[PDB]
Symmetry: D2
Subunit: 249 residues, 4 copies
């Protein structure tokens, strides 16, 4: 079924995760045809500035994420940044997320595959679509069977990313495809998520937060919690009509 991975950018506090987990739990009961996965990072390991918020650590993060899975019965996903983190994170995470800049680190992919969990690799802004084939092959070699490739934009000049939707059908030849609606661009988020489902993908990825203008990360992009339902309904309707034309394989 269609996948909808959502949640706040960083684990600002397990309190915040519960508030968002509750709303995601509700949509979950409302859209039985969609599979929801709660997402949040225990650490922003690649911020541009050294003076930026990173998080409360791996343990506190895994802890809070457990609280969401236990209190709401939602599948979980977070990202790892170094091999060793794969095992402790697999304890709670149903899907292990590989950061875009790290989509080429062989040991990181192998470590994620070894846990037995599903793996979702954000496509590097530097990677060509056809070059994701070798990414998948690495993970398969590592024992991974449930593999996702996520579209998040490509380097277009300086400080700018463009979404080449030709990548969805191309990457689909070797793995399920997810579209990152918030990192690929706030005014262009919805327009582009509509294009993604019109083209065809196996799921969408959205960072959401109660009050984005106060979130300690991606405050200019995180989708306002209240708007999630309406966007999910919108893409399910477009998908229903457009799926009729999705090209085979």
């Amino acid at each position: 079924k269609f996948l909808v991975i959502a949640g706040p950018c960083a684990i600002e506090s397990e309190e915040l995760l519960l508030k968002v987990g509750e709303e995601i739990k509700r949509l979950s009961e409302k859209f039985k045809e969609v599979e929801f996965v709660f997402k949040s990072s225990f650490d922003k390991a690649n911020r541009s500035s050294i003076h930026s918020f990173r998080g409360h650590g791996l343990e506190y993060g895994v802890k809070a994420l457990r609280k969401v899975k236990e209190e709401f019965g939602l599948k979980i996903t977070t990202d790892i940044h170094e091999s060793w983190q794969a095992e402790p994170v697999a304890e709670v995470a149903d899907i292990i997320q590989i950061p875009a800049f790290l989509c080429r680190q062989t040991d990181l992919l192998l470590a994620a595959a070894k846990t037995g969990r599903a793996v979702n690799v954000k496509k590097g802004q530097f990677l060509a679509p056809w070059d994701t084939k070798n990414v998948v092959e690495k993970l398969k070699f590592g024992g991974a069977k449930e593999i996702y490739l996520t579209e998040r934009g490509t380097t277009f000049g300086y400080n700018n990313l463009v979404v080449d939707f030709r990548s969805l059908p191309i990457m689909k030849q070797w793995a399920k495809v997810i579209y990152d609606a918030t990192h690929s661009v706030r005014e262009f988020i919805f327009p582009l998520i509509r294009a993604a489902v019109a083209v065809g993908c196996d799921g969408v990825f959205m960072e959401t937060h109660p009050e984005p203008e106060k979130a300690l990360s991606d405050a200019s992009t995180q989708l306002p919690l209240s708007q999630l339902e309406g966007i999910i309904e919108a893409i399910l309707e477009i998908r229903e009509v457009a799926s009729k034309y999705y090209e085979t394989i």
Copy 2:
């Protein structure tokens, strides 16, 4: 507002070819009555890469052939001009004058088109940013143009490659009606999916080159859409447009 579908053979290879495509377009116009069709074809491919490539049979022949289509099917006409002097003669038949991508900044060509009183459709250059089309429209209004279209046809992305930045659709929509060129922005395997993306995002129309037998065409044999496939593609985009339409954001 009525969705626009601009389609036809890339080049006016012959008045016969034109009459064959026009016949189908006329049939589809009768079927898809909520669509406003415009028959398109160039009397000259003035910018081919090789000096040895097909160009056309002259402005005279082309305009006469287009006049035949309009006359025989009552279809609106559009064709592109390359130099200022061609605006006047072309305006005698074309309902919409098209400005080529590479020429979107040539002030005199735009002004020549605008004074004819006919509608003008400017293809966004592969070198231009979305927000820089504002001045393009301004030149047109300055020159008397009342009906203006901007067509998205891809952007330079490295060498020999064009990417479509769909954020351009809502940006350009701020100052003009927006058309999506499904055939030049891509190879044929991506025409359909990207056209689906265009209508989901939201545009005022699509532009498609179509030919009875693309493999024999004198230009764009690799990208022209087989005429038999036109109907289905049109039905699909109308379907996707409708279901996505309630979510189109206000400019």
Copy 3:
């Protein structure tokens, strides 16, 4: 010999052209090993805004340009924008310049070739280096024998141009190569002109003006007249040393 095409962006007045022609005349007598060509446009036919300065017309321009060639004995060059202009312009211009956006207009290239003069085609920001081969072939077919291709940057994201110096040796396979130092980028003008001669080119193209901050065009890029000599001396010295390593053909 090495070519140095210089002059003010637009023909603001024949007075301005004489002032610049005088200085170019002087450098001309000082650098006998270099061939100088006076450049200036009679019309800025492709400005972004309709409310921008375009010029004083073709006749007034051809007139003034004649005054420079007669009063200083300098070769002349200006650009055309439509076929018909080729003949009247050839009267004075030793080299006919084709605008970058127009490097693909077959009739414009043929019209320029027909006059018998030399032709210099600015490489479109949208063109790949290897694709200039067909540009040259068009001109040869048109009867042109002295052909130049000019590097002026390539589209790099939005509102930005990058200079891929790999184009110089590539384009050199079929035509002499000129480097446009002022349109390819003011702080980066000199650094890049140095790279161009280090790599190898047949000449440089520079827009210069007495008081750039008052020029009715490219006021943020035009090189200050007073600085021309020092830059010419600099590139001749680098060339002298670097030419030893220029690859054959």
Copy 4:
């Protein structure tokens, strides 16, 4: 200031290969005494595209082989790390710790390198803008790094292509010493010309992968420079640098 030349085989295929290249580099260091040479080679290619490609013989073997070079030729050493834990062991031999292009933003890796006290050279990611390296250097200084280098290795330009925007050299020079990677920025036919451009613009050093027989290398067989060609290339850039040096602008 002394020009830097960082060169060596891409991968530590064997301690023998290393000793063979080191011998030549030592010879050139004796000749070009105004140059500061640094022997480079990776103990692991942790980011190859294919799982079936050569990676290395382990950190243990690599560090021991590099220690051999320094020991036998008195040459400075540099190698790249991939995870935080490798900084400590690697710092026991490397005079300069290299940060891979794809990892230039991984805060912990940079901090790990900086605390060792060794110099750090960060390869500018193909996704990074020149001006965004300011924060890279800031992280390093924050972490205790006193000697910092930024290496230009090309920028993403469409798919499967990298362009070198030489304006980056003076921009990055504002906050750190700048090195030009002649071999990864390009294929071999453009190595020489672009390296000439780098020194004319102005940089503090060059980085070149070199191998006795590139066609047999276990990595970058297409771009590694034949060892026999190293001397001439170095002489040329020193010549071009000198004549262009008086025109280098002040930061």
